[PDB]
Scaffold this active site. Structure first.
Site, PDB file in Angstrom:
ATOM      1  CD1 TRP B 131      -2.684   1.592   0.200  1.00 44.12           C
ATOM      2  CD2 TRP B 131      -2.194   2.035   2.334  1.00 44.12           C
ATOM      3  NE1 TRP B 131      -3.439   2.671   0.585  1.00 44.12           N
ATOM      4  CE2 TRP B 131      -3.157   2.965   1.893  1.00 44.12           C
ATOM      5  CE3 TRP B 131      -1.734   2.119   3.651  1.00 44.12           C
ATOM      6  CZ2 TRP B 131      -3.672   3.965   2.722  1.00 44.12           C
ATOM      7  CZ3 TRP B 131      -2.246   3.118   4.474  1.00 44.12           C
ATOM      8  CH2 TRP B 131      -3.206   4.022   4.005  1.00 44.12           C
ATOM      9  CG  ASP B 212      -3.246  -2.598   6.486  1.00 47.25           C
ATOM     10  OD1 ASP B 212      -4.483  -2.513   6.627  1.00 47.25           O
ATOM     11  OD2 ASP B 212      -2.572  -1.697   5.944  1.00 47.25           O
ATOM     12  CE  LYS B 247      -9.675   0.737   1.432  1.00 47.30           C
ATOM     13  NZ  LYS B 247      -8.622   0.934   2.469  1.00 47.30           N
TER      14      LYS B 247
END
Lengths: 398, 398
Positions: B131, B212, B247
């Site tokens: 990311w 994560d 999300k």
């Protein structure tokens, strides 16, 4: 045993204090330890303008995409206009970088992180005393933190000569944390003459003023409360300004504030804004939508803007009424000047730690060990009770 | 000239890219560069459960006081249950410190700041690639940041042997950032066998895994997507977990997430929670109310919890349908295995930078220079157009 060396976080004495207030069986108990605004009925209000905005926003159910790192554009512009005044020359000349922040705290953090990166050898100076989280935020951000003289124990007022001389002695680019008005915890403020003299020094010595304006609207109205910020900016002084909407919107829990930096020209302001966005990127990526939409809707809708300013001014006047009421109540007993001279939600009563104990244990009135009282905790139901209590404690002697 | 040395923040190439997409006059243009979920109609959805919760919350207009530093208690408990499973032994034994955070980003930040303070000499290792904000957050938090082998350019898959050997060579207390599933940007995930072997090493070498989990629900459902977290915790491994609701609640702009740390016992978990609150205090003081109330209402109300899980599973299946649709479309032209083997919202197409240029300029289909496509940007209106475009570009040769 990976976390065997993680030390326990110190208990919060205020939490302990409030737990004792809850268990206190006495019907006439009074709590003035919580530092937020309560209305005439002792409740945390939902401002009319805020409710009305929320109602309107509710009829608009759309998707919630990421905001820009600097937050909502309409919010930023409204905040900048509110803080500096619509007609401010620094605003017209594009010399101000403004972004949306997570309360006033978030503004202090983003500002501190930016400053540490570009002024790593600067140290920070706060007032003696200051907001309980000033030292914590800036020390954890990597700064050595110092103090300057401020509160005058003997007068309940300001040691302005000592404050000015200490600040005059600082090296260039020293970061000076300043309360814009409504000082927390003491309620002792500079007047506009003292402000001009302080700015003379800040300018001449090339210092970095970080103005903390958490109570715009609670001292002498929105415009007068921002005098320090607006005068610094009119005079072209490099200034960071952290402003909070927690208190004057009664939106503590929706975490809304602003950070503004006043720069030498528009080019500089744009470079600074980018690096402030950089600090945000290293932190929480981008700010939240709900609270900023509410604030932007209130400030940018003339009907709501008027309704908001009106209620806030009534809040401002209610505190002033309580200051006068407790003052007059104390005169009936045993220098009560501090109660009407100090400003905003707090007053440093000057009561000793023993007297604070007596106030609690004997009279069921709760203030901090420092002698800080939240004046906003006063209403018609308790101001007589409080004035009687404090009057008796003061009269009986330290 | 106070800010004369503040460098300009680098322009965002994606912003530039999207500006070019807007000006693009071609009716059949397709944008797959924005890394968020779009529905069958190419819109950012408002989930039914979220709308229904917001509706219910609206009929409750009360004051908004400060939340605790760790956030809303009901939120924390719901989040912990969702991530680890209600019946997780580490949850029952009180070995998990959980707090509310500002998205997954905020969780990474709070975690990083806590880790820097207590493990200052540890360095951080991320996947190659990872990311875009992982390096930024941890380097700005004070860590030296390194990489381990991960994506396999030649296969579009995983270099698991190289990944495992690199991680096995790390010194104790090395911080290892791991995607739980739905890897961003590549979509390449470990299987549960590879996970067990990785945890063997992490445990034996006394490393500090920072998982994560930004897409719980988008790979194989809520429970399977959390396997890495739940298996680490069942085995008693010191683990930090950052989870995002951006999300899977479609609440990007309301900044909601969690941070959980799994500790050796309940005593340790409580000391850690206090120091995580300390990190929050040094940052934004306390988190916001609106988004957390919505999430807590959805997760804690069985009717809404069911409606939410159902829509999220339909979202999960829609992405899988698009993966199969583009795969089959590409078979009609010119190893398309990666499109159905990779998982979550992203796929590393393996297209060269030149091929990415061709895809854009010739075929009006927009993906990142890295070859990252957001599969969620595909729908029935464009998946044929995309498969045709990529098929032609691949067939024509690099």
């Amino acid at each position: 045993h990976m976390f065997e060396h993680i030390d326990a976080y110190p208990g919060d004495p205020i939490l302990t204090l409030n737990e004792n207030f809850q268990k206190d069986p006495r019907d006439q108990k009074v709590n003035l330890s919580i530092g937020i605004y309560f209305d005439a009925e002792g409740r945390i209000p939902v401002m009319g303008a805020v409710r009305e905005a929320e109602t309107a926003l509710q009829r608009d159910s759309g998707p919630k995409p990421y905001l820009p790192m600097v937050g909502l554009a309409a919010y930023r512009d409204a905040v900048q206009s509110l803080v500096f005044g619509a007609d401010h020359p620094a605003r017209a000349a594009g010399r101000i970088a403004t972004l949306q922040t997570l309360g006033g705290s978030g503004a202090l953090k983003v500002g501190a992180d930016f400053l540490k990166r570009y002024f790593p050898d600067s140290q920070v100076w706060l007032s003696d005393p200051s907001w309980e989280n000033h030292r914590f935020i800036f020390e954890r951000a990597g700064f050595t933190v110092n103090t300057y003289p401020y509160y005058d124990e003997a007068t309940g007022g300001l040691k302005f000569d000592a404050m000015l001389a200490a600040i005059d002695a600082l090296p260039a680019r020293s970061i000076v944390l300043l309360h814009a008005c409504c000082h927390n915890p003491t309620g002792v403020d500079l007047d506009e003459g003292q402000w001009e003299k302080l700015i003379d020094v800040i300018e001449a010595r090339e210092l970095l003023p970080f103005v903390d304006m958490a109570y715009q609207g609670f001292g002498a109205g929105l415009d007068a409360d921002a005098f320090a910020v607006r005068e610094l900016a009119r005079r072209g002084v490099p200034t960071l300004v952290a402003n909070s909407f927690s208190k004057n919107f009664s939106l503590y829990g929706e975490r809304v504030g602003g950070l503004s930096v006043v720069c030498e020209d528009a080019a500089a302001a744009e470079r600074v804004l980018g690096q402030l966005a950089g600090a945000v990127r290293s932190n929480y990526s981008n700010p939240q939508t709900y609270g900023a939409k509410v604030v932007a809707a209130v400030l940018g809708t003339p009907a709501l803007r008027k309704q908001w300013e009106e209620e806030l001014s009534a809040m401002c006047r209610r505190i002033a009424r309580m200051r006068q009421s407790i003052h007059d109540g104390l005169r009936d007993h045993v220098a009560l000047t501090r109660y009407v001279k100090q400003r905003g939600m707090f007053t440093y009563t000057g009561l000793t730690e023993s007297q604070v104990d007596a106030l609690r244990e004997v009279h069921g009135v709760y203030i901090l060990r420092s002698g800080r009282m939240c004046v906003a905790g006063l209403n018609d139901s308790n101001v007589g009770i409080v004035a009687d209590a404090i009057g008796k404690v003061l009269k009986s002697g330290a």
